[PDB]
Symmetry: D2
């Protein structure tokens, strides 16, 4: 799983993700209008949305849970895998605003409008390991949150406390912790985007045989660490050199580089780990762009073309049928 935040040539903010899994999770695009009451049948817990929500997820006993999404105010949140360094409390903690793991994403999007608003509420917050339904256990997760100011934060609950890191890298991946990755970036300060044409090795002259010689040392594998490295420097390079050319498609070019291909990443259960879908949320415009592994054409769902004061949940069929434009 890879998370990305970007700013277009005309002020707009793009925030999305790569979902990297070896399976399906019955996912669909889910729309929730303003003032919508949600009741969990299992534990009788209630949530009424203050803002309209649009994102990817699934529904259990009429209860919506999200993998990533955005609200009407331009706040976006993505839930990425966090294998070993995560730590949830099994029961509620007194004083703290206790949030069930499955419900954290919705809680961010339904209640708040800005990154700052989320920051403040998260000071007295705690993630509790209570499942959505009794035999549907919570997954190991950590979240990236971004808004229309261009600022992004990272939520990671360790054994010590709930950490809210400022994300000045603009990207998130998976384990280890965020501070580990930021420090790991220092190991790669020798990388150069500019072409290195020649090298004088004494009597022998060494000439570059192709482009991209200045990046030799970049890891090519699909581990969380390597993917963090690639996506961070690819992003940096684009901002530095081609800021005026950043539009919707550039978001996908960066993430495609860290996308898992069928066959190359095999689990111990002998399944192929794929980048099943890539989403991108235009926060200002309230549009959920996404494409899948089977169908690469960008599909757009606009929340402003729905009734935000509606009474029902609207869902959209996950598109896994390749769409080709026939020229002749």
């Amino acid at each position: 799983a890879t998370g990305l935040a970007l700013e277009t040539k005309d002020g707009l903010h793009l925030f999305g993700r790569n979902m990297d899994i070896e399976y399906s999770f019955n996912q669909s695009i889910i729309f929730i209008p303003r003032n919508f009451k949600c009741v969990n049948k299992s534990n009788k817990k209630e949530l009424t949305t203050k803002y309209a929500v649009l994102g990817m997820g699934t529904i259990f006993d009429d209860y919506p849970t999200f993998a990533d999404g955005m609200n009407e105010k331009g706040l976006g949140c993505a839930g990425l895998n966090f294998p070993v360094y995560v730590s949830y409390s099994k029961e509620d903690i007194e004083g703290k605003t206790n949030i069930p793991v499955y419900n954290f994403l919705l809680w961010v999007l339904a209640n708040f409008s800005s990154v700052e608003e989320v920051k403040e509420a998260l000071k007295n917050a705690n993630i509790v390991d209570i499942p959505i339904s009794e035999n549907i256990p919570n997954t190991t997760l950590h979240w990236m949150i971004s808004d229309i100011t261009g600022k992004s934060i990272v939520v990671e609950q360790t054994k010590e406390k709930l950490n809210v890191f400022d994300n000045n890298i603009g990207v998130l991946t998976n384990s280890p912790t965020f501070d580990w990755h930021v420090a790991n970036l220092n190991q790669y300060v020798g990388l150069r985007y500019n072409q290195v044409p020649e090298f004088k090795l004494g009597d022998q002259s060494l000439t570059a045989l192709g482009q991209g010689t200045g990046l030799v040392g970049l890891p090519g594998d699909f581990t969380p660490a390597s993917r963090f490295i690639r996506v961070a420097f690819l992003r940096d390079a684009m901002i530095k050199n081609d800021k005026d050319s950043i539009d919707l498609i550039e978001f996908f070019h960066i993430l495609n580089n860290v996308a898992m291909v069928r066959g190359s990443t095999r689990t111990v259960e002998e399944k192929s780990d794929l980048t099943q879908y890539t989403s991108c949320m235009c926060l200002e415009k309230g549009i959920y762009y996404y494409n899948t592994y089977e169908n690469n054409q960008i599909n757009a769902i606009d929340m402003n073309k729905e009734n935000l004061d509606g009474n029902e949940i609207k869902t959209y069929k996950y598109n896994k049928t390749l769409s080709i434009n026939h020229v002749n």
Copy 2:
């Protein structure tokens, strides 16, 4: 440029295409040439009458077509990839050989021959000469990949000594150094593993895998011809080994997406961004030319069978640079 790829689908169809990695636009369009079309080079008066119908990406200077990558009606496909050094074109013609200009080699293969085996025989007494398409447009240093409906592919490189015709059992191609160098370089990566390594007992310390893809650690991530060659070769192999039965059109694109250049991270000495301008994919049996671009990632299809193969006009199609979004609601 470039990365070349050949692949066999679950239904047993053969896909052959390429990435084009240049930092500019060469005014390209998709060119179609019918059977028995006489192509007249106005600069040097050289004729070419096509035996088979031809379709692919290229450009036209003075009514004369030249290809970067294409295919014919017989399911023979050819792609032209950059080859900086290690290539020597004969300045003047050679006596006894079949003298073929650099710009014209690609069309020569597609217009005259139906199969790879037919090309191999004809290339025994062949030479590539350094004659420009016009006066002011010099020839680019090129090397080619040719594939057909049998599943076999060849690499054609002209060195100072001779014109080499390698067998391509890897199914891939990039750029300099020579093909034989790249094959030998694969041996460095015999320790790569597609399977997950979950743990390692470091004496007293237990090391557990942080995420997926630990076996492929050591793979290069950069965009040099060599590093791109290794990635595309092993990614391909992995898909054949584990998922032979799921190979289809879009799998071709996923493989090449990994070795695709991104804006900003590959900067030429003339401070310009090198990008994967377009990715083409030719379904050889069906004669359909699929392609997307850096600007528009939707695959566009151009079927040559929908045209009159006995026509008398070269037909072109505009190069799509406008993103095609599907508005769901």
Copy 3:
């Protein structure tokens, strides 16, 4: 700077280091006998040794400061560079056992006999930034401590508190923090010591053209992180496969691999960064083995061949003259 701990084929414990610097620090081997009073002229601070000390260091106004050394009871300590993540308090902290940076190494060796003894005292301890002399500022440091039990710890004072990590890796380098390096090891679980002879790449057969194919992916550079990786896996490989063959010279073979060579590592001041010396302490026998960049022959100083109840500091000239054995 690289630190290493090892166990011989016959029970003995070897602990030492690589000193990687672009300069000289007027270093010499320093011997201190039992019950020796040390008075700092600058700040009038006092220290009387409970145990005899032997190690590498220098002397300012009759005050000894150590880079690495051991005591008579078999406790060893090495002080390695810790650039950015270190944090010393400028003044003393009440309650805590405040220790000046320059004096920490001696404080460990003079007062305690075992790793456990040091662990206990370090619970209420703090490192204070007080210089040895007014214009001789303290360096950014973190320490590895090991004894005759085979156990090793790592002392790192961050902004939060004083951390004592259990070193089950048997090695130490430089920044980032120890927990960062231990986590970074997970990225390299795919490494194999065993030869990978062939690979079936479909119709093409790939055959190994030399030995050591299973290690492809190992970093070759001389950064603290890469050197941590190499030295940790080289150590592991030796324990696993050739435990019965581990003697004194094996210690040097491991560290030589991570040793800096003249010319390759240039500082911003255009100086060549070298592995100036490599020390190795046989903790049981009380022998300080070491060799330098100029002279590679192992030189041995035995503390038991000195008067441990003596009255003076004994020093030994740092050997930088190559010693060759003439066979004929």
Copy 4:
């Protein structure tokens, strides 16, 4: 095996030697042969009378010497390194050529020739034949490096087609693939920097160097012939570029120590540990053979000028495997 290295000291003396990377012992000792010594192979009755005095590492089977690496009185040095594939020895003799057995090539160079230029000319009509030193001891697949007091070095590799004699402007050598492959592989690492990169501004995030040697990130750390070749080549270059005036005997060892194999980390398929058994260094002008071992790291010197160069006996010296400690007190 192996890694070969040539280096020029501050005083202008020429050092040539090698690492030997085998997982066993081949009963080796330092062999000395005086002028005009007749070496008689008892198995196949072939003669060799030396023109110059010879010294180096090797072994003796049936009173006949064979070298792994050595030098002569004239300052010509030669080393034999492993060459798994890409080498083809002629099974039987070739008509017209100078037929030289594999085991005998090293001594042939040192006994008959004084300079590299003299060797080059003689190698024009030369061939390496696959004749064993005895009946039951087969020839190892080898390739050689020859250097002299001029500072010039050559690489000699016999392929299926011809006997190649490359110029060595890198001053280094390892093993398979061929020399020309390794030279081309250096081009992949043009972005390596000996100088420290202190910082990198990643937009909003400031990245500062954790330690020293950030420019050389991307360098391979493993012990394959290729990875060893790259490290030894650039480490050498760095020392010449920045510290030309500090080059002396021990600098030779520091360079090779980096590409030296450590016990346990290089495991053969026969589950044995591959080690750098010995590291030799020949001072060509002075005729002194310096060497250390895996067991004893102290450099041992054997001066050939201290012997009677007009002697009538082959003289040997025991291979030192006992650690030499200097007891200070």
